[PDB]
Design a protein around this nucleic acid. Structure first.
Ligand SMILES: CC[C@H]1OC(=O)[C@H](C)[C@@H](O[C@H]2C[C@@](C)(OC)[C@@H](O)[C@H](C)O2)[C@H](C)[C@@H](O[C@@H]2O[C@H](C)C[C@H](N(C)C)[C@H]2O)[C@](C)(O)C[C@@H](C)[C@@H]2N[C@@H](COCCOC)O[C@H]([C@H]2C)[C@]1(C)O
Lengths: 76, 96, 51, 64
RNA sequence: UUUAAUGUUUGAUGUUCUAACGUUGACCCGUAAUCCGGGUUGCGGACAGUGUCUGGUGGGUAGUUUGACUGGGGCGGUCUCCUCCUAAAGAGUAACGGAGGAGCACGAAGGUUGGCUAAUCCUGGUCGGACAUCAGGAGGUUAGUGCAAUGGCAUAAGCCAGCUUGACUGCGAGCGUGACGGCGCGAGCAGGUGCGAAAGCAGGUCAUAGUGAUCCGGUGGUUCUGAAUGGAAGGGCCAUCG
RNA sequence: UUCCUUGUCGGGUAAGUUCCGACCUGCACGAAUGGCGUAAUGAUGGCCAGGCUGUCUCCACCCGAGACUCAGUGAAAUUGAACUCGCUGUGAAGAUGCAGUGUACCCGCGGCAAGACGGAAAGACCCCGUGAACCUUUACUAUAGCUUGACACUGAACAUU
RNA sequence: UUAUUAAAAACACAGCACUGUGCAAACACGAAAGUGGACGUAUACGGUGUGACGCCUGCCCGGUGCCGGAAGGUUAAUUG
RNA sequence: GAGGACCGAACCGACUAAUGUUGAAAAAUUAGCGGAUGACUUGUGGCUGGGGGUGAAAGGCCAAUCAAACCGGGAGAUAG
RNA sequence: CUUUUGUAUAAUGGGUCAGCGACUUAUAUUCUGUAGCAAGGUUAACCGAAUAGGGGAGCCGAAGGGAAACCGAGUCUUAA
């Protein structure tokens, strides 16, 4: 019938890009699905928010037999 | 407090707590005030005479603030454990 | 808009209680669960009661 | 004449040591079954008034 | 066992009565006065009427309210939330721009351990058919996910079974997002618990909608307060409801 | 009272969206917020005809009062300042004032009203203001009045129970 | 009749109808006393609608109002 | 010799047109017009007062004033 | 000049001159400057041949945390 509705933007996306130094608990990326997967020292929240489980620099890699993007923390 | 019609800050927040009528008759005394008293022995009356606490004060507590140098006899006053040590360290005496 | 709010009262003497919802049309049986009672600091059984 | 305190503000804000104001959180009066316990737990302690709102509070509590 | 009738309290009314009260009936006096008052009398009579309280009625009168957006206003539509596009490869981004949804559900559809892997089609086969259950091959997720869309999902987040209540209490490093009120994510710590041989996992559900500040008030609790004192009322605090 | 609509038919006129008569298809007549008739009446509405005419074709002349000139007296609205032309273009988008160009010796008097978005009245229309007034009602909240009962002023006797 | 842009088809009207009113009338002006109604008494008075006269005035009581009814349901102060 | 009868002066009114519109005039003049024994007109005096009066009803009129007069006061009302 | 996205504007206001004509006052509060004193500072009413002096009632500050009891350089939260 009639349009005119929308929802508030959710501010998704990457918060800390490759090489950035983060503290433990820092949110790395907010996402709906697991577009990015948790690697080493990275947790996956209930809404699939990837957060650093240790200090260090974030690192993006593509691994596995399905070429999936992983995010890990190079502990430094 | 008017914010253009939006529910102002002091109305969208809840009220909390209550006012104690005993807090209005309670005062705190610094160690540096023990020398201002006259006679050495300190109590409610001597503190009021020295214009240190209000005339309506019924309870008084000595806290570790400032410093005491002379032997003082505290009587009928609550004393913190930190001030109790400092008063006894200056040869003072505390009696309930 | 069918689920009614209920409360689960602890079997212990303490008046502590949880609150939850329940569809009383499909599930007429009383709800009983083992939940942590923070007053006695033990896991006791909680029985249903009216809110 | 003396400035009159907004009495409604005096019942909701307490002045702290460094001049800030503490206040109770909202959203903790009624319907609470639907609220997560984690959410309700984080609303129990008192909070400080944000920097953007101090101007409104100070104007309402001149003797605080 | 029961029944009647004389004696009593309070009502429930009524037919009498006169003495309150009414009289815009008559007569007398104040008084050379159709006011008023007094008197006599008649007629009413505990009614009527008035005061306080109370239900109903009450535009007779009064005080007021009767939204905004808007390719002028009105009319119609819209107003909060979720998903996609517009949106210009970080975030955000308008229009009465283009399309759809939500105002819930679930004590299992949650937790854990163990297992499992679709759609569709072909071939063969009692009733049986285009389509039921059976068997095989092809196929490779074209399926499924409590519900819109999007992003996800095989280690399955999809399907099945066992045992269960972590849909725990206190907290919380550190971040995300908001002008703010707020909202969101969260390892780890303490207490206690479930499943597993164990490593471990569990602070609801694949994720993102399913919602309402404050005031006032209710219910339960409470080594808080208690207006001379002891209590209590009330208030506070905690849980929760409208 | 009929939107469609100048309905259709008839009458009147050389020609009639009006008028009169009828038809009924009454958008959306109708019986005391009356229906249909109706003689008389009307500074009432519509239409027709005779008479009459400067109403007109189409104006002409004339008589008076002004206008005009002289003497006397002597206002008003309005007014940023003015050394105050046309045109085309430009530009808060319709120019005396800008650009280009044309024209134009200085100053009166009688006339005419195209312009000075002329004068006059802080638009009556329209919108807006969490403006106003008055009016309406089954808006809200009250209330005078009206009405109900209780108690009081207010008593006795007796039935009935 | 709109003094000062509307004189009319508007208002009034005689007539008609309904309805209220038994007299200390209804009703109106009055915190009240009182006064008007009326020094009148239902052939009177008030209100409402219609509007000379002629022929007439059909159907609907579901809605709203008004009138009557009193059994039942509900229901105030009061009582406790 | 009846009549809210007829024609028509005074008188009362105000239908049409022109003029006037910084007027002769804050409503008139000129020429016509209606009523003109009546629900007529007029003098003097009186009464009704502002949410009130009065109104053959136009929201008309109530001192050139009216969908609530005038004067003083609240009052420097308030004016996003 | 005003008002505007924007004015020679044909948008507003002003005929001219002269005079008058609009951010004040009181009391609180906060900040800055400056002066005095300084872990202290200062008095109010009032007394007073009174701008002196007296008056320290008070107020602010040197301690906070907690709803509160309470504790106190810590305190609250919690069984911790
Ligand atoms: C007789 C002279 C009076 O003016 C008039 O009568 C004019 C004919 C009058 O206009 C009449 C006639 C009319 C047709 O306009 C021509 C009509 O539209 C207007 C409303 O009324 C003016 C133009 C009429 O003006 C017109 O008004 C309308 C609303 C807008 C017109 N214009 C701006 C387009 C404007 O021209 C005004 C308003 O009447 C003039 C006004 C300035 C004065 N007030 C009026 C008062 O009488 C009328 C009632 O007013 C409430 O009197 C005016 C002015 C003083 C005069 C000049 O005295």
């Amino acid at each position: 019938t009639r349009n005119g509705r929308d929802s508030e933007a959710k501010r998704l996306g990457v918060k800390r890009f490759g090489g950035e130094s983060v503290l433990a608990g820092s949110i790395i990326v907010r996402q709906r699905g697991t577009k990015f997967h948790a690697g080493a020292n990275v947790g996956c929240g209930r809404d699939h928010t990837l957060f650093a489980k240790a200090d260090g620099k974030v690192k993006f890699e593509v691994k596995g037999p399905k070429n999936r993007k992983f995010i890990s923390i190079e502990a430094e | 407090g008017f914010e253009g019609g939006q529910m102002p800050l002091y109305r969208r927040l809840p009220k909390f707590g209550f006012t104690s009528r005993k807090a209005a008759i309670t005062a705190e005394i610094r160690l540096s005030d023990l020398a201002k008293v006259e006679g050495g022995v300190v109590d409610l009356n001597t503190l009021k005479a020295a214009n240190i606490i209000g005339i309506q004060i019924e309870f008084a507590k000595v806290i570790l603030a400032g410093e005491v140098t002379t032997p003082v006899t505290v009587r009928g006053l609550r004393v913190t454990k930190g001030a109790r040590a400092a008063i006894e360290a200056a040869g003072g005496k505390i009696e309930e | 808009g069918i689920r009614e709010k209920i409360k689960l009262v602890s079997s212990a003497g303490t008046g502590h209680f949880y609150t939850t919802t329940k569809n009383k049309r499909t599930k007429p049986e009383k709800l009983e669960l083992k939940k942590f009672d923070p007053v006695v600091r033990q896991h006791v059984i909680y029985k249903e009661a009216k809110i | 004449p003396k400035i009159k305190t907004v009495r409604g503000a005096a019942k909701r804000f307490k002045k702290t040591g460094k001049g800030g104001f503490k206040h109770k959180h909202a959203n903790l009066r009624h319907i609470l079954t639907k609220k997560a316990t984690k959410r309700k737990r984080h609303l129990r302690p008192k909070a400080m008034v944000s920097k953007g709102d101090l101007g409104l509070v100070i104007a309402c509590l001149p003797y605080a």
